[model samples]
Structures are given as C-alpha cells and as structure tokens.
Target chain A: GPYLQILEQPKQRGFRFRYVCEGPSHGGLPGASSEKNKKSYPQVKICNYVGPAKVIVQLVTNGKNIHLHAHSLVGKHCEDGVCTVTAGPKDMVVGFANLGILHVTKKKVFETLEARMTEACIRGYNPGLLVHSDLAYLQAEGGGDRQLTDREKEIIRQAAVQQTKEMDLSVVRLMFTAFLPDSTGSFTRRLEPVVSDAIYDSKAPNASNLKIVRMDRTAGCVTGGEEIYLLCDKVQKDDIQIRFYEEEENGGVWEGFGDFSPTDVHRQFAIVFKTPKYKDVNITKPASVFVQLRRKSDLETSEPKPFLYYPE
Target chain B: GPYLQILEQPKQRGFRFRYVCEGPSHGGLPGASSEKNKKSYPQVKICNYVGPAKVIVQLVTNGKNIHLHAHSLVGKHCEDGVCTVTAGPKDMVVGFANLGILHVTKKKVFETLEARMTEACIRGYNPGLLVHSDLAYLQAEGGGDRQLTDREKEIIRQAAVQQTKEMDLSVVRLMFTAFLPDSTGSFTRRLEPVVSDAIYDSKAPNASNLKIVRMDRTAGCVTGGEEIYLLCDKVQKDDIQIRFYEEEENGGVWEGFGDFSPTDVHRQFAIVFKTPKYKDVNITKPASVFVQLRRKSDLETSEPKPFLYYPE
Candidate 1:
C-alpha cells in the first residue's frame, strides 16, 4: 500500500503511521524519519496526513486463517512500526499485509489499501519497502512485551534483504513481527507465536530457575533463610560466578541495583548461596532479585532469572 | 426507557437502522416502530451521512451500573433521544432489558464500556444484573471461534423480541448485543459476553461418555508421543463414533475431509485409537487437528476440540 494511515493523536508527538515494512526485509525504520534508514518513515511518497484526513485502521475481516504479524514499520508516528489505532486499548492486532502476496479480504476496500498495499509491494523488497496496510485484529486477546536484541534484529532485516537478493519471485513476502505498542495500548498478529517467535527473539531473560522450580523459596519471613539451588544439568562451575542484582525503581534501571553478596560455585548442576539481607532487598513486599551466572572469562551468561527475598 | 441502535454495513443492500425488538414477549421487531412487528431496519430516517458527519459509534459510557445490552436504534442526529448515529450495518440486536423488566441504560451511554462492565437497573434481580457489573476476567486472553448455526442464531433474535412483549413500560427499552466487527478494529463490546451468554444456549454435546481432558505435550516436537486419553463418565460403543477432521485449506470448507476409519467406541467412556499417521495430517511441523464425537444414528456431533498432532 502506498498509503500511511494514522491511528491516533497525542497532542505533542501526535499519532501516525509510515510504510511499516520496507527496509531490510520490506524496508523502513519506524513510524518516523527521525534517524533515517533505507526507507524513511512517513515514506515521503504518502502524504503526511494529520487531523481528520487520516483514519483509524480496521480488522474488517478474518480470512479464516488470516495471520498478519506486528513489526516496527518505517513509520512517522511510532517506532519499530508500532503506530496508533482505535476503539481501543484492546484486542487490536496491528500488523502489515502482503497485498503483493495475498490480499486479506476479497472485498474491495480491504483487498488493497485504496492502492497502497500493492503499490508499496511493486516498490519491491527494498531495505523499508513494504507499505503497510493499516490493519487491525478485530478478534480478542493479544498484548506486547519484548525488544529483540541485535543479532535477532539483524537476522530478520537480512532475511528480507536476502529474499530480494535471491529473487524468489517478487517481494520478500515474509511478515516479520515487532512489539510496537500503539499510542493507546498494544496490538498484534500474535495468532502465530510459533512463526512470530521464529523471526526474532524480542525478550530479555527475566526468568531465574533459582526459584520457580524450587531453586529459591517463597519468602514469607520475619527474617530470612539460606541457600538457593539452580539445577541446570551439566553446567560447569569452575569458571562461573553468581551475582545478585536487585531491580532499581526506574526501568528496573538505576537508582536501585547491584551485584552484591555472591560467593557460590556450589557444583556443576547447582548454585548454593545464602540469602542476601535487608539493605539488599525490601523484604516487606518480598522484592525480586536476579541471579546472574556469568563466565568470568567471556562475560557470557544464561538469561538472568529472578528470585524473591523477604525480611521483617 | 424505550429505544434501539444499529450495527454494521455491506453496501447497496443499503446500510440502515431499526427498532431492534418488539417481538413475542414484547411484540414487533425494532425500536421506533412503536407498535412493533416485522423487520424494523433503518426504522425510517436519519440522513445518509458522509465526510466527517458520520462518526463511529462508541462503547462510550458504561452508566456506573451501565449494563446496557447491545441494540439497534430509533435514533436521530443527536436528540432528546440524544440523537443520530452514522453508517451502521443495522438491526443486528432486538432483545430484552432485564431491568427486572427494565433497560440497561437510560437517556445516556454506558458507565464503563472501557472495562466492559458497569451497573444497570434490572430491579429486584439486583445481583445477577448488578452482581454482573463486578465481573471481568479481563487480562488479555481469549479468541474467536464457531459460526453459530442458523437456528441457534434465530433463537437469540427471538429472545429479544420476546422480552419486549411482556409490556412493563411504555417502550421496548432493552439494548442488544451483536458481533458486528467495526470498520476499524476494537469494534466489539466483548466484555458483555457474560450477559450475552445469559441470553443463549449455544453448546452441543461433545461427549456423553469418554472425554479429552488435557494433553501433556510440548510445543517444539519434531516428532513423537506417548499416549493421549479422552476421559469421560461412560458410554456404549453402539451409540457413537469418533471422527478426526483436518482443517482443510479454505475456510475448512471442502478440499480435505471425511468420516473415514471409524470403528471403536471402546469400553464405557473410552476410544482406544492410535494417533493418525503422517498421511493423516500435514504435520512435519506439528499442526492442530480437531476431534469430534458424533452419534451413530443421527450424525449429531459435538463442538470440535483441538489436538496438536506431531509426526516422526
């Protein structure tokens, strides 16, 4: 679609959309041209619509197995393709449609975005080449969480770029996913987590086996306890070190974090350590703490897992 | 206390409005049709809107106890009947207002269409209706399923008609519910499902004896499995047969289908059958399949249940 539909309006930044996909895969950066990637968001070609001229996207029809995934589009209003939308902060699956590949609705207005979806496609797989069809998932239940890391991000970009390089017919045709929350809330083509997960890993390891599997105890104490055993089979202990870090108030960012109270190489498949005391965690609410097992040599570590510690 | 509201649009069939209810218990079909009867769509007039005049209808307000059901309207462009709405699909809901013989909301919008709940009158039936305003398992889960059979469809259409016949007030004041996906997504009043279900009996017998409780399976399996059991109370082999259906490509309409190889009913409440082989499904990647139980004599069946089938 050569069109960019704006879904919302926040007084300052305002709500809008850009060619969601178009860059590496289809090609585009985000909802804005802020930094400028291959295809600048609000893609220049499509008029920069504002106020009432624009419209909120709709999930008009479900092609039975209709599956569109959300991804950061080279947009003007959102980042990573997450734009604004309407009638909600609810089951709104916002994603791109491959008009060049398959049209979602055999019905007119839906099949092609006035002439956008296909137009963006004929533009072919640039590096933000695909013009997004302002779409929505009318069905219920789906949310967002994750910010894929570098390799994962690069992989998708390359995959799309590669499709074009190899000439497998026309466009990349692969619908990559992103966690772009619209202005009001979040949405997705989350129906295909299997495929969505295959494209990129958009999450951080906040899981600590130290507790969920009984590696750590449920703290209900006036004081505290001892030891936590994280049983990961065949894990080597010789070069590993356990570090305890508490989530700070910010983005779990600063004001409150540390790598304190840690001395444990217990075993190959276990990490036995005493609980960190009060000044370390707010025992009143059983605050969460992460256990990091990094290899001192490479700094490489398993995804950090969380364990709660409470005190009087 | 007497009114109605319409829902969607499909063209030349000309989108319009209606009375919604006034049948059986109430009498007639839609809202403004004072006497009521017959299809009361576009219950007469409200100028065909365009440009910006036509606004999308909203789940706007939930009258504190705003348990307003969905209903087609007898509205104008904002009136004492605080009036007119835009291009609607029309007369979708025509039903009751259990205000213990009262409407869900009066002279206003709802209280919390946001949380999908609120308080509604309903009189002495105090709790159920009001007790209802207190419910919401809302956590962003749930999906869409099933294409309600025609009769099941008619049953609800008539239920609303009936509520209006009991004449407790001067108007057929009940609001109705409809799944008219909006032109834009987030177009449903789903939170009203609790009350929506209160008006219908849409389930079919899936098993009289054996049942499928839960399956112990991991998502990432190249191929392999132990055993899956369908546990139930008890049943005779002579009464039913088990059928496996692969969701055919298009709308699961035709293409791939059957009632093939149906031999056992096993012991009372059991169907000892081997999982279908690869030719059974397109499962190199493991896909979902539906299992259904049908009666031998009449072919009557239950709602299809999902089972992930993996292969070697």
Candidate 2:
C-alpha cells in the first residue's frame, strides 16, 4: 500500500500566472518560504512503495468541494494542463523545478470545461479519480466503475454545460496521485491523492501580492506634498493605493493615502505620487511611519516599507 | 573651414570601462545630464563649413598637457580606439550611442603606448594633431610636419617606452577633429581639434560612482544594531563605508558608521550592515537622518537615502 505525501508545497502567493500572450519560460513556481538567499521548489514523495511508481499532477478547484480546474499545470513533464512522471526507489522523492501555472483565457474556459467533462465521462470514476478529480460526475450519477451509456454521457454533458457559466478563475490547487505496479506489472494499484494549499492568480488585480521595490526619496517635509517616484511589483493602476500609516496596540492610530490619479501609474511597475500630510504637522521632531500598496477593492495591503517626515 | 563643437558631453562618472574578458555590449556612455525618464547621448556637430567632411574621434589624456591615451574608443564607426566618419550638412550633428570605453589591460598598456607614439611620429603635428594629439612629441623636440628619420623615430619610441611606466588607467577624454576637402577631394584641410570632458573608469573602485538602489529596512530603534540588507551599484569591498551623517552650517554635526567587515559587502552590489546608534537615545519622538555609500580613500559619498530612528 502506497500513499502520497507533499514534501514541499508550492508557494501560495508572490507568483504570477502567465497568459499565452506573455509567452513561455517566464520562471518556475518556488516552494513556500523561499527567500532571496535560499530557494526551494515544490516536492512530493511516495510512502510504503519504493521500487517504481507513477505520479500524475493536475489543477483542481480550491473550494470545499473539489473539481477539475480550467487552468493548466505547465512546465517540465506536463502536457495539456496535466503532468505525468515516473518515480523510482533510487529517487524516493520527486522535486519539480519548472512548475508554472498557465492561466486559461476567458473565451476558452467553457470549451476546456466541456472537454474535461467528456474526459471524465470516458474514464469514469476510479480509485485514482475519487473525490478530488471527478467529484462532480460521481455526485451526478450513481456509483458504477463501468463505462457510461450515451444518455448518461448526455446528462453529464448538460450538467457540465450548465455549470460552465460559474467558474472560479482566480484560484487553484495542485492534486497529486500515485500508482504502483501489481504482480502483472501494470500500474493499476492507486493510492489516495493529496491536494496542496491554494495558489492565487497574479493577474487578478484584487488577489496579487503587493510589493515596493524602490523609491527615489523616502523622506519629505511634515507638510507633505513631496513628489516621489516609486517602483513596485505588478498592480492595477486604478485599484491600487499608496498608504502611509502608524499602528498602535489596537490598530492604526493614523493613516494617509498618497495622492495620484491612474495616469500617474506607469505600466503597472512604477508610480509618481505626492506624499500626504502627516497627522501632526506642528511637531518639531521628525516622525517615522510605514508605507504600503493597498488594494481599494479588497482592503488588502502589502508588507510595509518605511517613510520619514522631517520638520520644515 | 570646419570647426568641431561638443553638443553634449559624455557623462563624467557612473560608467565602468569593460575588459575584453567581460565580452561586448554592456551599455553605452550616456549624456552628462541624462535622467531616468528622459535619456540622451554624447553628441558633436560640425560648424562653419559643413557640406561634406571627414571626422576622426579618439581618446586623449585628461591632464593639463594632453597626450594620446592608451585606452580605446569602442562603438559604431570606431575601430582600434580611433573612429573615422564621413559627415555632411544633411546630418550636421552626430549623436553617439553604443560608445563604450574599453580599457587596456595592464599587460597590454605598453604595447598600445608604443603603437600610439609610432603613429604620431609618422603623422607629425597637423592642424588636427596640434597640441591635444601629439603634445608630448612636440615638447620633446622641435615641431616639424614632415616624414621622420630613423633617429627621430627611435627618439619618439624611446620616449613612449619610458612614458608607458606612468600611464593613467582611470580617466580619459574624447577628441574630435574635422577635415574639409581642398581643391583636391583629398580631406587634407584639417581643422583645430576639440576635446570633451573627462570620463572615469567604472571598474576603478576609488573613482566609481556610488548609489543605493534598495534597502530591506529604513527605520529602526534609537539604540541601533538592527541588520539591514542594502542593494547598490558596483563598489570596492575593502574601501567602502556606509556613512550616516547630519550636516549643519559648520559641517557634520553628528556622524556614525555602519558595522560590517569586508565580507558583508556581497559581490560589490549589496551590503549587509548593522545600524549605528543615533546621537540621542533618549528622544521621545522619531528623528530622521540620512545614509550614503562613502569611499574610504577619497571621502566621496553618494546621494543620501533617508533613515529614521524611533524611540525605543
């Protein structure tokens, strides 16, 4: 008996999913807790069985009830949004280096969903395709491992066609399945699958991670209105805010927003904004504060960079 | 009669001369006042008589008494440290892009010096080669614009061999000479040459420009000793300092240095340092200060980035 275990889960945030228009080979997904000095990637291992095994990785819905996702798992050992690999005892653990999440375009989502439904209708539910892979098909029809009739396939097609109207495009999870060879040398013995933490779409303006890369000047007069050129990670021009704040034991004691129109944000990587007035401009001494990029729609803020206000 | 004028001078600093080992195509020398948003390049123009003329550009010494330098002017229309271009009235102004300073390695300096002196000994002092191009040879012997005898050639060679021992590898200037056609289309009518300002070698640790690109943290407690990761432009590991200074009318009112060994400066582009204690540790409010990269040998400092010391 073999079981799948996640040795290193893929980093959940700070990664951007690429569109086909952006081309391939941007970069690969890193493991959670990767740093500037030390880096790691997503990894998994099989327990109990060690001679030889097969593993399949695919995108799954990040909901309470799982379903096949429309997005693709792209990179090494991957094809058609799916990744298949052979594992052996010599290499007990598998480390994935080129694992990128390729976002499906809006117009092609319905078509991909229909294809996924037809694929499930052809394969039916098995031990490997239990709750995580084809849960929708199982919930719709009674338990039967045999092939589906034309009417049953038509029913599944209608359900999939109706469900394609509502799909979550911003988040996905990776599911891994392990298969071991039986006495007949066929990899038919399946193990329970494992699902990873949710990975958010970087293209989703509301969900992407916010970061400040550089600032031309970090200090200004207490009266504020100093123009500063700042570089940042990807952000939607209209949905972002430069927030300066001071936090206390309870929460924010004082807060201000940088003044800039959407036109001031250049290509989502840079912004020219004016510093806001400090809460107490009359203070003779300099004051220290924090600045961050915030999303106006979700009220989500980035880790703060520091700012100083000097007395005029 | 044609005269050469420098429309735009190459930037004085912040550029590094590349070695052959580094390969080609790093970047070009920019104009002195080039900015982040608006960019410009080194430029020159032919004035007075500009129907069609020949222009020659070369490197010269930055000292009060000029001599043919041992460095190379590498870029478009340039070959073997000398750039020859045909100019016309249609394009009266010539803008240089892709103009880089290729340094002569220590082992190759003497050879280059010998070649430059031999070329000058053969050409003598023309209108184009007056004081700037061959002043050393003129100072050594009386001026004459004719073919040199073997004795005179040996004298110039001996002088060049002796002078190669004291060549400057850190700085150079660009010289532009214009040649107009006489009754014969021979380009023999030479105009007085013009020389641009100095350009320093970026590889010279003591002379290279200092810049702070980014920092992990900018605010800390008044007691100090907080570790910060800072990214910067190229710098020498042994002769660089992180200087924190407060300047008044009389000069530095208070100053301190960051705590780091040579090992802390990573790859000449980053530094890991511990913050120095602020002058006043008992302050109730935050105090703003400035930080800069200072060359220990020359005491030259970069444009300051801001920092804040908050009350503990």
Candidate 3:
C-alpha cells in the first residue's frame, strides 16, 4: 500500500500554483482519448486559492519536436468536475477539492494499446494511495487575499503622493518637403509658437497658425516619453505664407512658419510645441494654452485651423 | 564769348586707384626750427594722364560717436602742375598734384590733430580723378582670373580604391567602474599592432590579462562614420548594459562580458574598429582609434590627459 505525501505547502505569500501531467504510469485516467495514452500531448494546470480555489488547464502537443505550452486561469470552483474536451491533440488535468487528476488519451487504438502496455510495465499504480489529502490543507480562506512587505507598502504610499503635484505639458515638431507643379518658385516654411498674448489673440502677422503637438500625464521634467501626431494639408500654388500662433487673454506671439512664396507649394511644414522651461520668457501656464494656424494669399486669407487637445 | 558743351562717350571705361601716407607732416630741414612758420608737416600728391579731375576730403574727431566732415574740390590745374585748394573742414582737397601737399611743423599742432583723429580716418583721405571709368570694367577683368568650372574638367574622379575581403578579429573591451584604482590595467599595456596580431592569431586569451567583447561594424555602413574610443575609468554607477553590435553583420555578434560589474579602479579596455559595412573589416590593419577618459581614474591608464589617437 502507498500513502500520499504533501509535495508543497501554501502560504499567504502571494504565490500561485501550476500542475503538470506527464506519462500514463503516473496513475492518470486511461482511455483512447486520455492525454496519458498519447505520446505527443501533455497536460498542465494553474491554480490560485484565496477563498475558493480557481484552476486553469492547457494541453500541448509536439508532432515533430517537443515544445512547452503555458496558460493562465483565474476564478474557478475547486469541486470535482470534468473539463470540456476540445479538438486536436489535447490533454486534461482536473483539480479536485484535495487533489489533482491527469488524463491521457490517444487518437488511434494501436497507440492506446501501446500506452497501456507501457503503463503495465511500470511499478506504481495504486489508485487509492494516489489521492493527495494533504493538498487540501493548502487552500485559502477567501478571494482577494494578499500579502505585502513593509517596504513595498511604504513605496506605494510615496508614489501616490508624488503623482498629485506633477505638471502636464509637452512639445513636438514635424518637418517635411513638397514640390511645386510648375517649379517656378521654391520656398520653405517653419511653425513656432508666439510669445505675446496680444498677438495671439488679435491674430497678428506671424502669430496666426499654431498647432498643439502632444501632451503627456506621466512625463516629468527630466525624463521624456511622450508622442504626438500632427496633420496638415498639402501646400497649394496660390498659398503665399502660412503662420502659426498661440493665443492668450492679452494677445498673441510669433513662433515659426513656412516660406511666403507661391513656388513653395506642395511642401510640408510642421508646428512644434515644446515643454516650457522656467527660464524661458514666453511659456508660463502648464495647461490652458491653445494653438491655431492661418494662411494668406494675394487677395484673401483663409480661416484659422481648429485647436486640438486631449479628449475628456 | 564761346559756350562749352559736354559730350557723353558710351564706350569709355574706368579704373580705381587708392593710397595712403601716415607720418610727420613736415620738419626735416635745419634752421626751420624757429618760432616764425613753425606749423608745417609731410604731404602727399596724386596725378593722372587724362579726364575731368575732382578731389574730396574729410576730417573726423576720435570718440565713440565721431562725426564725418565731407568736402569736394573742383578746379583746373595750371600747366606748372599746381592747383588751388578748396577746404571745407580742417582737411582740404587740392585740384592738382602739387596743391595736395600739407605743411605742419609745430609738434603741438600735429599732436593736437592726431589726438582728435583715428588712424583709419586719417589714412582714408584721397585726391584723384578719371575721365571715363565704370564698375563694369573692373568686374570684367575679375572674371578673366576665374578657375576651371565643373564642366571643363570631369571633377568626379575617384580618390581611393574601395576595400574588399574579410578579416576575422575582435576588439578588446574597456571596463569602466569606480571600484578599481589604477587607470590602465594589464589588458591594454601592449602596443596596438602587437595586440591586433595576437587577436588574429588566437593568442589574445593567452597574452597577459585580455577580455574580448562582441564586435559589430554594421552601424558604420549606414552612418558612414564609425570608430571606437576605449575608456579606462568609471564615470557613472548606472547599471547600463550596452550591446555594441550594429543592426547588421551576423546581427552584430556579442561575446564575452556576460555581466559587467561596477568598479572604482582604472581598468584597460579596447575599442574595435569597423566601418558601417562588414566588408570594411581589416584584421591586418588597424583603423583610426583613440582612447578617452572622463574621470580622474581615466587619466591613470594612459599618458598625457588629452585623447591619445593611435597614429601620433
């Protein structure tokens, strides 16, 4: 007679469990469709017990070379139950209230015969002694149970406090070129934010078209890890000058712009917004700023582009 | 009475002549040192073969904000070669070469005027004339001395032949850590040529203390500018793992130094040479190489604190 032994013990240490099923000689269920009967398929199970035990099962097969298959499962009951069989080369591991059961199956009868004959040659095959009653003692009281060290708890508290005082602002710039149809004149254009509020509000000469490039919440003063995308229309032949500006209560200021020439049509230009430094004269408010763009021709001017920002 | 008429000749050209004389205006003769005509100095003259003559003069006071004193001279020269002088500011313009002379002997007089003028302004005075001259004639002669243009000589000739073939060798790794003490270690003590030969002969591991890092020259292919600088001393304590392989050439192999440990001592490190392309590898010949150290420990490894480039 054989008796079960506790292979592992559970603690409130926030660790999870994984079960792996190997050969038919390991007291697994025997059938043509049992995983133990198949030479390729192997069975695995993961379990997490807080209050009620949860189990996940996965089957892996290697027709040519051996491979590993890993899967995760969460929030399931731990009573005696059968896993729903799926298609293909598959295996199963069942989690009981106190123990786990592995099943081995084969597709062909000859494969099953060979697997059973191999199992007969094995030494240990006592079903009664296979029950692992000691495993039941490792179960948890309930769900949502967790353990935390003193240092880890202190770190979390400090991180929460630092998050509230951080500022949220960023800048980005994009540049590209375009060609004219007639090739008569060529020009370049750059876009930058204006420095004055009066100019930004009144739509002064160079302070017309400004674009907001990007914003990042997690970004800090030293580390930069944010991306912003911009879109602009192709330059037309009739276009003379394109200006970008930032608006404020008092007025506006000039930033940067493209060339003011008809031959510069078809070229691409970009407007950039950079993080404001404390020493810089223009940038003040971390938030509450807007950007716009304006275009001009010989006879008339076009409407300014709409402002962009993060959606609520 | 007869009236004089002026005719314009379209085909005539002109030339420009300029000169300056800076010295005592007078007094190199004996018996002239008396109190009678005590103010006389050296003078200069100008002459030409033909044309309507004109002269201009100006005087300036020496200060941060000096004012210009401009005046013009207009007159005909007598056959005796002397002409009348027309003065506006203290400076005068004489119509003929002889009238251009100035007489100043009193040392106090010369000193007072010299104190009120800058060297540049005093040397800028001129007296000359030309009948038919133009800027176009001067520009025409400038073009005659032009050098060969691109079309005249096929300027696309190649300067050096390209390198072909492969050399199997690796670069030495320079360790940087604040833990060690000495700057250069036993690793980099040998000459570069000797070190390179040892590496090619597979004798690198046997020669003293040697460490072979992974080699990758693929980046040199795309950037076209690739070289390595070996550093000896530790600059920072950051646990940074940099794979020196480029994005090509066997994906840029990485070898040795499974993990780099921090150190306070000066250590020896080798810089491998490679071009952007793998085809540029030359095991027999060393490429441009140098050693740079930032910390005080870096100076301990090599002689002369400035960077030590291989050739000199």
Candidate 4:
C-alpha cells in the first residue's frame, strides 16, 4: 500500500501570499527549518511506492471542515491554480522549492471555473468554497466520474460559486494529494490528502509582526506623568499602542495603555509617550511591571520590556 | 603678584589612592577631561611670572580645615613624600602625569616624621597631622628663620604629632605651591598655593564606583516574589543591596529593597534575587519604578534601571 507523508512543512507565518496583480516571483514559501544563512523548501515523500507517481497540490481551508479555497498554488510545475509533480525512483522526495500562494480575485468568473472543476470530482463539501470538493460532490453523487451532462455541471458550478463568495481571503492552507498507478498507467489511485498549517497574507495589517527594540526610560513614578522615548520595529501608527501589564499568580492581571496620540508615533519606528498611572497611588513601595508594543486591531503584542513604578 | 593656578584638575574620583605596600608605577591621576582614547594629566601654570621656578606638591586634608594628610605625593621629582618640578619661561605649563599617592604606615615612626617637618613650616594648624602647616607654624613663631633650636622644634613636633593621630586615611587633596627667586636668587618668593579637588582612595570598599550593567528582567508583579538576574560591576556581597525607589511631587517618596542573601551575589559581578512585594498589592494598573545597586555602608547608589509592577 502507498501512503503520502510530509517530509518538510512550510513555515506557518512571515511569508506573504501575493495577489495575482502583484505579478509572480515575489518569493517562495520557506521550510519551517529555513534560516537566514541556510534555506530549505517544503517537501513530501510517497512511502512504500518509490516508482513514478503524481503529486497534486492545491489550496484548502485551514479550518477542521476542509473545503477548496479561492487562493491558487502558483510556482514551478504549477498551472492555473494547481500543482502536479512527478516523483520517480531514487528521487522519491518531492520538494516544493518555488511554492507560492497566488491570491484570487473575489469575482464570479474564476470562482465558477474553480467550482465546475471541483464539482466534477467532489468528495465532500463544506460551507465556504467547495470548488475542489464540489467536483468530488458531483462525482460521488453521479456514482462515478462519467461524461457529465453540460447542464448538470453548470448547476453544480453555480452552487459552489455561492460558497466561494463567502470565503475568507486572509488565510489558506496547502493540501498535497498523491496518486499511484496500479497495472494501468493512469494516476487514478488517489492517496489521502494532507493539509498544511495556515498561511496568512503579509499585506494584511493585522497579520504583520510587532516588536519593541529599545526604550529611553523603563521606570517612572506611580503617579505616572513622565515621558518615555521608545524605539521599535515597523508599525502602523494608527493601530499601535504601548501596553503596560502585570501577570500575577491566580490570575490577578492588570493592564493599561501608555498615553500618546497617533502623531506621537515617529515614522513607524519610534514612539514618544507618557506612562500611565498605576492603579494604586497609595502604594508605599516600588513595583515591577511590564511594557510592550501592541496592535489595537487584533490584540497582538511584542515581547515585553521591564518597567518599574515608584509610589509617590 | 605671582600666583599658582591649576590649568587642569585631577578627576574627583576613580583614581585609586595606593598604599606603599602596593609598590609604585600603578598609573597616574587623570585630568577631569581625559577620555579613553585621549589621555591627559593634571596641570598647572605659574601666573604672571615667567622666570624659572620650583613647584612643590603635597597631600592635604580634603576638608576645609586643612591639615597635612598622612598620605604622601610620589612621582617625578618626588623624594620621600613631596613632588618638586622646575618650570621655566616659554614652558610655563607644569603637567603632573606621573603623580601617585603613597599611603603612610599608621604607626609612630612616619607620624612623628611628618609632624616634625610640618611644624618647621606650619602657617596654621587643624586637628589631624598638620605637617605642612606645622612647618609654617614654626616659621611664624620664630619671627623669621635663623635656624631651629633642636629643643624648640621637638616641642612643636610633639604638638603636631598629637593631631596626626586622628588622620582620615580615605581621602586627600593635592596642594601645589610655586616658588620664584628674587633678584638675589634667594628663591624666597612664595606664591599662593592652589588645592585640587578631593581624591578618594579606590581601594576603600565604600568608595569604589557603583554601577548596574544589565538585568534579566525589569518588570514583575505587584504581588512580588519573582526572580531577577542582574549583572553589574565589582561589588562586595555583604555590602551590596538592590534598592527600589520613587520620587513624587511635594516630597512624597517610596523605597524598597530586592531580597537576596550574600550567597546569592554571584562572583561580585552578578546577583540572583527575588523582588520584594509592592507596598500596595491592590494596584490595578502597571506601575513604573526604579532600581539600583546601593552600598549599604555609605548609602551610595548606582544609576538606576527601570522596573515595572503589575497588580495581582
């Protein structure tokens, strides 16, 4: 028996899924273990069967209820929206060195095309975009793959198109499906498909990394009316915040925001702001606390810096 | 009138006062403006007089009540305990690049020796060995110098010796006196002596510089009880403490200490300790506080680093 296995998984984040209008060759998806000086790529292997076989790669939903995604797989050996690679003999390991996610335009033309093909071989369907599964949906329903009546295919296409309309554009996962030939030379013996971790669009503001580099002052009075100059990595001024927080045992948590206007954020790399007052002005001793850069939209925060407060 | 003026002053601190037992060639006192890459030494000039002259440098008490210090000035042109250098026209600036303080043995031999010479030239006296002023005292008593009667000098020496018994060994100032010759070449014209700022003994445990280089964390919970690893310059475990403080308007102040045993201080350069509980555990927001390494013996503190406390 032949089985599909993932040898190397793509990095879960940092990589950007580019829009078709942005053109190609932006960059390839890196393997999880890739580093600045050492690069690697997503890889998979067909266990048991080492002879010639076909591997089909496509986009799928990241959620438990897997469905065809509106995004496309675009890279070497990739055509239109899907990838097909041939693995042979000693080179049984399939490496995706130039794998890239091609974002789809939210419209009816490509959506209907994806749905029609998916409906021709549909296995099952989820609510959002069943383009690939819709074909499986049509195949399972028609009892097998047969010459579909043009009218029946169009009806299934319309049904999946409605589901694609509600698809999420920010994130998608890669699915690898391998097929082997038995006696016949057709790649019709389909192995179980394996889906990857989600890939997020880097262009989306909320998904960008947040980090704080350094700060001028890490301590202030408890009354909290002192200015601090903080340096950081790139950020969106409108969505950024200086968060002060404390985590205590048994879940006694306290949080506050540093005081600053959007204009106080300097060119997306620095921020000048006043510290927020501690909740208890009557504190008779000094307190240690934490400060970090945070994004208001998704509540994502950078690694924290230490801050101290003295009771006035 | 000719006068002695300091062109460059010795740095007030950092330079160590060495004991005679430590031997010589330890290094000279640095000028206040000396930097790591560019070196300079204490310097002076004979104001208004360009002729050849002799400059004598000796150690004096740092206090307003001037007294000859038990410490000795040693370097170029120095003999026993005083430095003498010749300055001429066109080269009026006298630089003391090799000046060093030689510690006196706290016994009767050196004490009586210092008092005897001081009494012969004593101009005035303050408690604690008035060696130089004691000499001026005898000069003023004899009306004018003829030659000292051995018995008369002995009485003055004994009187000054009593004052030497209470000498402070930790700090001393450099006093420079310049002498110009009159027409008869009598070398009798004395200019007003100038005194440099106090120089503290670097070997004195309490006088060493205090500094906090870095810390593992700067924040903790108001409820306290967190471990922090701190890196610092050399310190005495028994004499060191971590101080947390805050200053508020109208004189409100709060202070606390980090909890650590002497054994917790690692190799004089690092400390592992637990944070103290904040005075007000009811704090609802993060509070910024300050922390510094303090010498328990002198209450001397290093420059502070910021710390934060979160409410539990």
C-alpha RMSD for every candidate: 29.2, 14.5, 39.4, 25.1
The per-model lDDT (C-alpha) reads 0.31, 0.75, 0.22, 0.72
Give the poorly placed runs of model 3, Cα more than 4 Å off: A1-230, A237-242, A246-284, A287-289, A298-312, B1-312
TM-scores for all candidates: the values are 0.18, 0.42, 0.13, 0.41
State the lDDT of candidate 3 residue by residue for B1-312, as single tens digits: 111111111111010111113232222211112234643211212221121222222222122222211111112332111122332233222212211212222333333232222221222221110101111122111213434334212211110010001111111111010111123331111111100001111122212122222121212222223443222222232322222221334565322111233431112232222222222333333333322222221111122221111211
User: How far out, in Å, is residue B309 in model 1?
Assistant: 46
Across residues A71-181, which tens digit of lDDT does each residue of candidate 4 receive?
777888976567879888678899888888887766743563455355324432221233433344342232334455676556555655556445677788788888776
User: What's the residue-level lDDT of B125 in candidate 3?
Assistant: 20
Q: Taking the tens digit of each residue's C-alpha lDDT, what string does model 1 give over B1-312?
A: 112233311111111222224222332222233222444322221223212222222211123343323332223332222122433445323222111111233222222221122111111112134223232222122233223345433433343343323212122222232232335543332222211111110111222323443222212122322333333234445666655556566656311122223343323433433344323433456766676666665464555676555654
**B12: Cα error in model 4, Å:** 2.7
Greater-lDDT candidate between 1 and 3: 1
How well does candidate 1 match the true structure in TM-score terms?
Answer: 0.18
lDDT minimum window of 10 residues, candidate 4 chain A: A123-132
User: Tens-digit lDDT track for model 2 on A1-312?
Assistant: 568999989887777888888889988888886776767888999987667887878788766657777888788898767787888757769877878888888788767766665554444323124223433344222332446567655655565565454467788888887777757776656678799888887767668888877675778876768877776777788899999998777864788889999987765666778998876567688888889999888787888988998876
How do these models rank on lDDT, best leading? 2, 4, 1, 3
Question: Candidate 4 regions off by >4 Å?
Answer: A1-312, B48-51, B108-129, B132-147, B213-216, B222-241, B245-290, B296-300, B303-312
Ranking by TM-score: 2, 4, 1, 3
Tell me the TM-score of model 4. Answer: 0.41
Candidate 1: regions farther than 4 A off: A1-119, A123-213, A217-226, A231-312, B1-312
DockQ of each: 0.01, 0.02, 0.00, 0.01
- Which ten-residue region of model 2 chain B has the weakest summed lDDT? B125-134
Docking class of 1: incorrect
Instruction: Kindly report the root-mean-square deviation of model 1 from the true structure over all alpha carbons.
Output: 29.2
